Short mmCIF file of C-alpha atoms and ligand atoms in Angstrom, two decimals:
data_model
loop_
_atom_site.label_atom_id
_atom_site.label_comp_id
_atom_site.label_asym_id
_atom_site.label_seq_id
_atom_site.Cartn_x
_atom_site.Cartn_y
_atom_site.Cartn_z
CA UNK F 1 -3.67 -10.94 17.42
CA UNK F 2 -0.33 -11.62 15.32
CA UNK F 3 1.48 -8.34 15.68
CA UNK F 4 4.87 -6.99 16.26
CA UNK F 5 5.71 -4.01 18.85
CA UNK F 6 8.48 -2.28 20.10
CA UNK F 7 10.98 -3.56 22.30
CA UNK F 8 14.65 -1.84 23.92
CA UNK F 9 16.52 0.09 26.66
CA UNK F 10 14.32 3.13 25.48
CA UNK F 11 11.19 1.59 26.81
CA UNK F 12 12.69 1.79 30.19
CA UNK F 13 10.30 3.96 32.21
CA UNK F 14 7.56 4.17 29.76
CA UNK F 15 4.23 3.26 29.71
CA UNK F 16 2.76 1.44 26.67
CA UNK F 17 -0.94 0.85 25.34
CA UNK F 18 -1.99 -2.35 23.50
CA UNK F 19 -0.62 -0.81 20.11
CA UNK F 20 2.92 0.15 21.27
CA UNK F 21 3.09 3.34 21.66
CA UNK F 22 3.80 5.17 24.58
CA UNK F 23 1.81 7.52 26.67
CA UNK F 24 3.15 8.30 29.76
CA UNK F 25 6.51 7.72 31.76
CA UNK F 26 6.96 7.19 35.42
CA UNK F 27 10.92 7.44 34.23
CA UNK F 28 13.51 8.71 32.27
CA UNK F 29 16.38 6.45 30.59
CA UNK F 30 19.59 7.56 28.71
CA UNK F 31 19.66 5.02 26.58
CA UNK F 32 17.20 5.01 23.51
CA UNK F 33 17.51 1.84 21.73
CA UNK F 34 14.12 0.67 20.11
CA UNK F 35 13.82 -2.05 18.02
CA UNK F 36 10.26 -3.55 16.36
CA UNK F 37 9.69 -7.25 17.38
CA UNK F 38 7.26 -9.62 17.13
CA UNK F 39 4.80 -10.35 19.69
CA UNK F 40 4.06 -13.95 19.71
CA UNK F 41 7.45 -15.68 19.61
CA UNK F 42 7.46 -19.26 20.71
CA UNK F 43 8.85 -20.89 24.37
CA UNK F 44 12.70 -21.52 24.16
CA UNK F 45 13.31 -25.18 23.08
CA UNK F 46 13.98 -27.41 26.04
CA UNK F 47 17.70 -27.88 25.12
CA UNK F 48 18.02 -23.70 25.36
CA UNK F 49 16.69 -23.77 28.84
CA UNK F 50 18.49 -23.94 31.75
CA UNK F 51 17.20 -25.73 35.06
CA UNK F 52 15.76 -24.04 37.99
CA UNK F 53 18.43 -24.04 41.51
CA UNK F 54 19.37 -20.31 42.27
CA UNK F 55 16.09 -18.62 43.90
CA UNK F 56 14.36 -15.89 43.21
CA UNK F 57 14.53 -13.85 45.94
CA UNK F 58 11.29 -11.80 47.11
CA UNK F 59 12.06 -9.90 50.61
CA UNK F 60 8.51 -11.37 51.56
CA UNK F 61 9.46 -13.12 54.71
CA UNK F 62 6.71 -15.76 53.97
CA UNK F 63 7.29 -16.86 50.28
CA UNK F 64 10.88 -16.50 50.70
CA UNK F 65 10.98 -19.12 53.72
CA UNK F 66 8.34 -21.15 52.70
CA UNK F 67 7.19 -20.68 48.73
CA UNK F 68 10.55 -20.21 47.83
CA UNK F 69 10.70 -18.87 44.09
CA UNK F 70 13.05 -19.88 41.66
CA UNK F 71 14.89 -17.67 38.91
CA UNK F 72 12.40 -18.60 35.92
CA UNK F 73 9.92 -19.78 37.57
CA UNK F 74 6.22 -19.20 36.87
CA UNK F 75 3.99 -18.60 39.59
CA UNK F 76 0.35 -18.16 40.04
CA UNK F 77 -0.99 -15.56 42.35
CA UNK F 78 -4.68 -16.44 43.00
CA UNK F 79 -7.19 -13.43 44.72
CA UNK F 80 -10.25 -12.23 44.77
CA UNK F 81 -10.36 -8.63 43.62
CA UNK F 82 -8.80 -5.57 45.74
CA UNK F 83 -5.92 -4.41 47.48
CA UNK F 84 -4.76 -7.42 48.81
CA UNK F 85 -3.58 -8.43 45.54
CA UNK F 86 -2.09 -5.29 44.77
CA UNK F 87 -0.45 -4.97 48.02
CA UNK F 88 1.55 -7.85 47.64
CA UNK F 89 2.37 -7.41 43.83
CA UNK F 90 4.13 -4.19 45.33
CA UNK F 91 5.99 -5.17 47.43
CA UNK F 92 7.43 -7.95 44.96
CA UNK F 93 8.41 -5.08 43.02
CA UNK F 94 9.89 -3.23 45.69
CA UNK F 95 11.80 -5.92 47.40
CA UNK F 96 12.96 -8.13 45.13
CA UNK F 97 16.06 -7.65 43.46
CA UNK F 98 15.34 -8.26 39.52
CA UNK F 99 17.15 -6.40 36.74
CA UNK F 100 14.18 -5.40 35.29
CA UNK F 101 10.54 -5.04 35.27
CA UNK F 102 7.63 -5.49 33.07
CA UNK F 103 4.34 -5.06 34.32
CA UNK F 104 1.12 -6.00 32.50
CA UNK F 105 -2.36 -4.46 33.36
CA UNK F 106 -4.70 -6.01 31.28
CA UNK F 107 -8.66 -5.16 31.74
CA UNK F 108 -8.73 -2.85 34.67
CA UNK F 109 -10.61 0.25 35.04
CA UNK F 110 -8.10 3.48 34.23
CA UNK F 111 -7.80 4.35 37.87
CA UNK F 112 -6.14 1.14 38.41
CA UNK F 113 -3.71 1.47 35.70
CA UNK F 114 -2.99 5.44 37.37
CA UNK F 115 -2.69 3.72 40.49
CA UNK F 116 -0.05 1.79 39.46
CA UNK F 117 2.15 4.58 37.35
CA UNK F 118 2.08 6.56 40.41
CA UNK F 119 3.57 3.77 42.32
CA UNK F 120 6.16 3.51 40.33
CA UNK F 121 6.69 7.21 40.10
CA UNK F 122 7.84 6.71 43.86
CA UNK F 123 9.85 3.33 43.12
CA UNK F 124 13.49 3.34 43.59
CA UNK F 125 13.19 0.62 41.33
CA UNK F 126 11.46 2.95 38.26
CA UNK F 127 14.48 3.27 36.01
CA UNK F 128 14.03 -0.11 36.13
CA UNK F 129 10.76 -1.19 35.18
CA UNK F 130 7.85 -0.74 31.85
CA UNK F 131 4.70 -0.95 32.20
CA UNK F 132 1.93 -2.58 29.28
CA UNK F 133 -2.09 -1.86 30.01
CA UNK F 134 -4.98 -2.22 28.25
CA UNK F 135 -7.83 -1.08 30.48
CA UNK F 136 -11.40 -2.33 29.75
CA UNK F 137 -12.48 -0.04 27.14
CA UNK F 138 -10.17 -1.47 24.54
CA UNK F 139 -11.34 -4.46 22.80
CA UNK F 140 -10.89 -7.92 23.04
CA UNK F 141 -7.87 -8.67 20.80
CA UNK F 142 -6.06 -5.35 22.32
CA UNK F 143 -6.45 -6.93 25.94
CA UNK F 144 -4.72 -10.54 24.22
CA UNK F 145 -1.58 -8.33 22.88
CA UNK F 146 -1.03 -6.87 26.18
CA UNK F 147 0.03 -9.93 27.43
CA UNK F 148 1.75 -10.27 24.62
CA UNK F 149 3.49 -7.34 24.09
CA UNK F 150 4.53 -7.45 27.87
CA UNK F 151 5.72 -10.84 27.17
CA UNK F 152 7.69 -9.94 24.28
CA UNK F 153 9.68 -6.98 25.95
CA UNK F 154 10.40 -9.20 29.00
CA UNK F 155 12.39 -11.29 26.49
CA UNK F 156 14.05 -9.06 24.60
CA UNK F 157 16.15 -8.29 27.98
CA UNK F 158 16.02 -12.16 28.51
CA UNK F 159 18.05 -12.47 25.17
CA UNK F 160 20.30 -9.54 26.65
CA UNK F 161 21.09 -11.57 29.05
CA UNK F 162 18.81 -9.82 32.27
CA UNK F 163 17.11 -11.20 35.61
CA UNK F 164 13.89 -10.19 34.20
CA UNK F 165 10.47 -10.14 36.30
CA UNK F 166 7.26 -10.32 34.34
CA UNK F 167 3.74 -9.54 36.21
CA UNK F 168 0.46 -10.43 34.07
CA UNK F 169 -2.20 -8.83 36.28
CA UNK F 170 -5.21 -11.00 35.15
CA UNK F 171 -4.35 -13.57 33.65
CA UNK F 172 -8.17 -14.28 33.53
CA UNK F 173 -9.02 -11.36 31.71
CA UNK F 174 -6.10 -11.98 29.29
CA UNK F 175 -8.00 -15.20 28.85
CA UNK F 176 -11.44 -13.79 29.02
CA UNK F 177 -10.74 -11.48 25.87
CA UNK F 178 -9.13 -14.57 24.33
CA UNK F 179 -12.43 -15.99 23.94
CA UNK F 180 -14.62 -12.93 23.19
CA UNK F 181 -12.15 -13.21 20.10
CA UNK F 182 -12.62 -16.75 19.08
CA UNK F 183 -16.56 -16.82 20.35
CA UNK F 184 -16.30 -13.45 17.42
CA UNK F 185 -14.51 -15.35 15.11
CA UNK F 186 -17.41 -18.03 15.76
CA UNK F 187 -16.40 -21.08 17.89
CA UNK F 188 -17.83 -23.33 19.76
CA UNK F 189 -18.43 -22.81 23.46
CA UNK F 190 -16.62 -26.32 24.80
CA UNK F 191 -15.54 -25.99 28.53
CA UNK F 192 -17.95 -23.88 30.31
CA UNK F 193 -18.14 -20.74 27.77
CA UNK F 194 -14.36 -21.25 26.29
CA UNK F 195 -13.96 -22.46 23.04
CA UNK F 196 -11.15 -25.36 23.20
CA UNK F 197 -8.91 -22.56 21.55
CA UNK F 198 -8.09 -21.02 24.28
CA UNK F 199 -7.06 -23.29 26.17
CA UNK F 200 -4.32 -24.62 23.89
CA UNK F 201 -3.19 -21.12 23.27
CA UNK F 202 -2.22 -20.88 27.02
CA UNK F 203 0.70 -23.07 27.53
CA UNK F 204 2.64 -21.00 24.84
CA UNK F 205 1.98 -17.90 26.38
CA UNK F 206 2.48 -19.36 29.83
CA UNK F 207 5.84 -21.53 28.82
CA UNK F 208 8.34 -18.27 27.00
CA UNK F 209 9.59 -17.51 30.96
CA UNK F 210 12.16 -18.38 32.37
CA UNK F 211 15.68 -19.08 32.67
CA UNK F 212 18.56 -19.49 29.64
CA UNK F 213 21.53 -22.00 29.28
CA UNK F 214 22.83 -18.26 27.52
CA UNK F 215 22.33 -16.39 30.25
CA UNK F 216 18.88 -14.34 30.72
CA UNK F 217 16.10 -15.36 32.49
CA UNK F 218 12.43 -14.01 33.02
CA UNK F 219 10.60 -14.70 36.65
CA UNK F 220 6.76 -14.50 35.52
CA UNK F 221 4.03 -14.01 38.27
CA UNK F 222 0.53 -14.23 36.63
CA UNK F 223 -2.39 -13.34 38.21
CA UNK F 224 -5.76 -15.47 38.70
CA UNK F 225 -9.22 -13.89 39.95
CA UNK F 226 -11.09 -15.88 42.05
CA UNK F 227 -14.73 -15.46 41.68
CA UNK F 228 -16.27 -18.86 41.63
CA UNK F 229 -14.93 -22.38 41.86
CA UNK F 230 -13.33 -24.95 39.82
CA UNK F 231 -16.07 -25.95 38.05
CA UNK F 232 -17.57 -22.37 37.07
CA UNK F 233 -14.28 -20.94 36.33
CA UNK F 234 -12.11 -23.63 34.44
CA UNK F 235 -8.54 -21.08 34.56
CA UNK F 236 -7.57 -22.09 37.87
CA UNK F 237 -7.32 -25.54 37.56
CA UNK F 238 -5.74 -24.86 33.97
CA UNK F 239 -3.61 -22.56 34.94
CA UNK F 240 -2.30 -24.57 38.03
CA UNK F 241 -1.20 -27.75 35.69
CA UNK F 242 0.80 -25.40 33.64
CA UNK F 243 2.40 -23.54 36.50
CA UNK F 244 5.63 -23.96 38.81
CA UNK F 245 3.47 -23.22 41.80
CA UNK F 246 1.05 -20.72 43.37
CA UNK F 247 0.59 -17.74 46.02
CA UNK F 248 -2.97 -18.06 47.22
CA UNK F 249 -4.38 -15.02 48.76
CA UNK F 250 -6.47 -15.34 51.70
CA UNK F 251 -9.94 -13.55 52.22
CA UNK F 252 -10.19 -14.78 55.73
CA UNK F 253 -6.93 -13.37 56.33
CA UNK F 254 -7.29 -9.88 54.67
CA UNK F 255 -10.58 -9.67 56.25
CA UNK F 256 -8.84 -9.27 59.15
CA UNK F 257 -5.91 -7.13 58.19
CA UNK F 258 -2.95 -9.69 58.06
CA UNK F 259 -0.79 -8.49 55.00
CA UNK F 260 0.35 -9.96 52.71
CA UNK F 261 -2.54 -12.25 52.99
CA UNK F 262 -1.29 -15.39 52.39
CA UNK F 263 -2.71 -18.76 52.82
CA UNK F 264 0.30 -20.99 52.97
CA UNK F 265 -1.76 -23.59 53.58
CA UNK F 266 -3.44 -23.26 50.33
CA UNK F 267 0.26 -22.37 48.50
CA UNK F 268 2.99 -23.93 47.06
CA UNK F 269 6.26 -23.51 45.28
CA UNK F 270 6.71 -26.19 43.25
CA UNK F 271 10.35 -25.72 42.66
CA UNK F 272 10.86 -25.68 46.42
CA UNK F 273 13.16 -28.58 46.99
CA UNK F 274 15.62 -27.60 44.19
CA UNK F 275 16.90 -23.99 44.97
CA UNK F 276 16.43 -24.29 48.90
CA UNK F 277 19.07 -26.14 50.65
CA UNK F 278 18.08 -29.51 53.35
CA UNK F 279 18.75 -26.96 56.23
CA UNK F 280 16.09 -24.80 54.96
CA UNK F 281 13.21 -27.43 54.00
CA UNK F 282 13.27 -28.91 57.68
CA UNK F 283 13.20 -25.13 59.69
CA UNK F 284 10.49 -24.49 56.58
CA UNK F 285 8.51 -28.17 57.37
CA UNK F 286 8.67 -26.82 61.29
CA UNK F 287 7.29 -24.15 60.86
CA UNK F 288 4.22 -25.19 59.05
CA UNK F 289 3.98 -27.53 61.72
CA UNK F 290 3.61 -25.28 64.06
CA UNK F 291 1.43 -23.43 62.24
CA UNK F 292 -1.00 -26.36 62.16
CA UNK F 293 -0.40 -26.28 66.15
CA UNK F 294 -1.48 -23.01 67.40
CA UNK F 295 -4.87 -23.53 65.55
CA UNK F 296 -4.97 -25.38 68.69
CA UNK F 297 -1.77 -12.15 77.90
CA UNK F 298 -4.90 -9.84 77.55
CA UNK F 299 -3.26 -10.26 80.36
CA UNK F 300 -1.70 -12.00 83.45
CA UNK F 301 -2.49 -15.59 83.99
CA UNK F 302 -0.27 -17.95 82.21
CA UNK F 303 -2.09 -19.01 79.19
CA UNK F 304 0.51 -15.99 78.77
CA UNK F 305 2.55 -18.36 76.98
CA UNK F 306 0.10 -19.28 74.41
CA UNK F 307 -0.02 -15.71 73.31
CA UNK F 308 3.29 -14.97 72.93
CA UNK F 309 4.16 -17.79 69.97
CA UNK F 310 0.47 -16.98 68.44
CA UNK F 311 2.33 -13.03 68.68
CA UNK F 312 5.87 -14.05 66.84
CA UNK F 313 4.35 -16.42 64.54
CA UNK F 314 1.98 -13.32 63.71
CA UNK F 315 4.67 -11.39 63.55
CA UNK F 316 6.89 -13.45 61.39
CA UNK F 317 3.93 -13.59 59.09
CA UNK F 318 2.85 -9.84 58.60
CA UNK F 319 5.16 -7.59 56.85
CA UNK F 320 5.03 -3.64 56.48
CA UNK F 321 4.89 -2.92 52.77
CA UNK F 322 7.96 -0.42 53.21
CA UNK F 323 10.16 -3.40 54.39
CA UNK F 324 12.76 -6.06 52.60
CA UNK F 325 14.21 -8.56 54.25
CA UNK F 326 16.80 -10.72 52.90
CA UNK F 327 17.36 -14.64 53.11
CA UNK F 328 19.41 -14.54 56.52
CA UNK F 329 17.57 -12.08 58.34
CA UNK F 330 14.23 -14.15 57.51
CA UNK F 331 15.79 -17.07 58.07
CA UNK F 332 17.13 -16.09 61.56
CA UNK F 333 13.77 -14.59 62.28
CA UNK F 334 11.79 -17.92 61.40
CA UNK F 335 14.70 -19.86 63.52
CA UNK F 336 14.52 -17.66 66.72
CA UNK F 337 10.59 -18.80 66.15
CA UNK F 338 10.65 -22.76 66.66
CA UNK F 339 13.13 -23.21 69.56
MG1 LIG Q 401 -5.67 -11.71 19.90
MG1 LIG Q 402 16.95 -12.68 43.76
MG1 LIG Q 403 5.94 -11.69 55.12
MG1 LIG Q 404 11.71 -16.35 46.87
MG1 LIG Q 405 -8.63 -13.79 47.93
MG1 LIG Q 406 -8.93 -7.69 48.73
MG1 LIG Q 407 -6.80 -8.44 45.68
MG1 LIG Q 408 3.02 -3.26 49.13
MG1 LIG Q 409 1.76 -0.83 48.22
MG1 LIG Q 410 1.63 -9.94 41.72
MG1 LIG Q 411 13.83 -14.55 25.71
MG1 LIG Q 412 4.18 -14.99 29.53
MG1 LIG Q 413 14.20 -13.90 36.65
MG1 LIG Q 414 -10.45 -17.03 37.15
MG1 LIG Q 415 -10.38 -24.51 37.40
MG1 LIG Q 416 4.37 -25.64 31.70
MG1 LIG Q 417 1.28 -24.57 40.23
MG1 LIG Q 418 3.34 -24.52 52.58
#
């Protein structure tokens, strides 16, 4: 729906349902500034926005050497339904180095939204951060505002002139409740279930990030289930024309306990090339390289040589979700890997 919610400093630290209002807080702020906004405010105009060249910096050793984000870009993060996903969307939290964060549950069972508010509890980063849910027992046009009301804080601090992250967790429930709401309203099913409404309603939401000629920016990470393929499910291939890029998350991989589980095959950072420097996309292009190659101990016979590259590159690759490493140290440690 059309709707206007609250937006400030005072938010910081709460936790807000799909009218507004708060009802919980993983934080305390000083500050108590609360204004009343309007919730579906249209993208910057392209001569407001600045270009994308300073990164956005993760502490993920694999997106940061080889997905690199940009400040204001909008990424995908495509995963079937777990931890994985939520393992990763931590540590983004945790390790990156935004001014603030706001996080936007939208469709998820009440444990999951719990689940979350206690991680931020034990953030460093809570002072920080809001939170926006709307778990599935709300209705259809309540799950839509979430977005939207997440959205619309992220840019009030945008206009204030922050390094703002925004996380849409489901972005195909967001778009799932956008059609129970115009299949209510009484439209026509065109793609596949989705009246041609929603679909045309996604580029606005998915174009108000990122970055300012003024100053302020919002990084946007947006979630996409994977359930079925491109045909059954039309999002993904929407929402990858309209994105700067995506994360996918690997089943194989979690399957077998590599986290994060990232395919970086199946990944890519659009925005690559412009905000890492030439030294960076050759080590980078090596290393996928040798990725490709080891496709290709246990414990005293020299094969012992195979296993110890297989063993750093599977090092360099897992991460422990309690660790952030910054742009030298990963790029040392992806160096010390290719010589
Ligand atoms: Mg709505
Ligand atoms: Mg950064
Ligand atoms: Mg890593
Ligand atoms: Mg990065
Ligand atoms: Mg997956
Ligand atoms: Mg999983
Ligand atoms: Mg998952
Ligand atoms: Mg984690
Ligand atoms: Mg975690
Ligand atoms: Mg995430
Ligand atoms: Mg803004
Ligand atoms: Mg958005
Ligand atoms: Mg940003
Ligand atoms: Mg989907
Ligand atoms: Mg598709
Ligand atoms: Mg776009
Ligand atoms: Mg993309
Ligand atoms: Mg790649």
């Amino acid at each position: 729906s059309h709707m206007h919610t609250q937006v400030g400093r005072g938010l910081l630290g709460a936790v807000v349902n799909p009218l507004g209002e708060v009802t919980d807080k993983f934080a305390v702020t000083d500050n108590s500034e609360i204004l009343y906004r309007p919730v579906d405010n249209a993208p910057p105009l392209y001569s407001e926005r600045a270009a994308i060249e300073k990164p956005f910096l993760t502490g993920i050793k694999v997106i940061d050497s080889l997905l690199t984000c940009g400040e204001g870009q909008r990424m995908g993060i495509f995963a079937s339904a777990g931890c994985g996903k939520t393992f990763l969307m931590n540590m983004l939290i945790e390790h990156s180095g935004a001014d603030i964060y706001v996080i936007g549950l939208i469709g998820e069972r009440g444990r999951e939204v719990t689940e979350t508010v206690d991680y931020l509890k034990n953030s460093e980063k809570k002072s920080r951060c809001v939170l926006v849910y709307a778990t599935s027992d709300y209705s259809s046009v309540d799950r839509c505002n979430a977005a939207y009301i997440a959205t619309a804080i992220a840019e009030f601090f945008r206009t204030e002139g922050h390094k703002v992250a925004l996380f849409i967790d489901s972005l195909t429930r967001y778009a799932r409740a956008l059609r129970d709401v115009a299949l209510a309203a009484g439209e026509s099913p065109a793609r596949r279930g989705y009246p041609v409404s929603v679909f045309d309603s996604l580029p606005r939401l998915l174009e108000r990030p990122g970055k300012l000629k003024a100053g302020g920016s919002i990084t946007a990470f947006y979630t996409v289930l994977l359930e079925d393929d491109d045909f059954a499910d039309p999002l993904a291939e929407e929402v990858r024309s309209i994105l700067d890029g995506h994360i996918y998350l690997s089943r194989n991989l979690a399957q077998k306990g590599q986290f994060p589980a990232i395919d970086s095959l199946k990944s890519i950072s659009r925005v690559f090339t412009q905000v890492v420097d030439e030294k960076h996309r050759i080590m980078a292009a090596a290393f996928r390289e040798l990725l490709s190659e080891i496709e290709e101990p246990g414990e005293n016979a020299s094969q012992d040589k195979i296993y110890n590259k297989i063993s750093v590159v599977e090092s360099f690759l897992k991460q422990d979700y309690r660790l952030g490493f910054t742009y030298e140290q990963t790029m040392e440690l992806i160096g010390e890997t290719i010589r």
